[PDB]
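Worked example 3 (structure in, sequence out).
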């Protein structure tokens, strides 16, 4: 849906940001029981979750606009 129906440059930017957050989570992962690795993973997941929150905010704005425009079941 959020991908452009052509061109969605904002969708591409949000996907790139989510991929960068996932790459940070891969580089800094908290699955180890060690506190330092857990904190690095928590910071990477916080950055990825901020990027995902922005992308999902745009997507949910588009979905809310679609639901407001169309009340069809």
């Amino acid at each position: 849906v959020l991908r452009p129906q052509v061109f969605d440059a904002a969708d591409a930017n949000a996907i790139e940001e989510v991929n960068l957050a996932y790459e940070n989570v891969k580089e800094v992962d908290g699955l180890d029981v060690s506190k330092e690795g857990t904190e690095a993973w928590e910071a990477a997941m916080k950055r990825y979750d901020e990027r995902i929150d922005r992308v999902e905010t745009r997507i949910t704005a588009r979905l809310r606009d679609q639901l407001g425009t169309a009340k069809n079941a």
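Notes: The radius of gyration is 16 Å. The first helix runs from residue 9 to 27.
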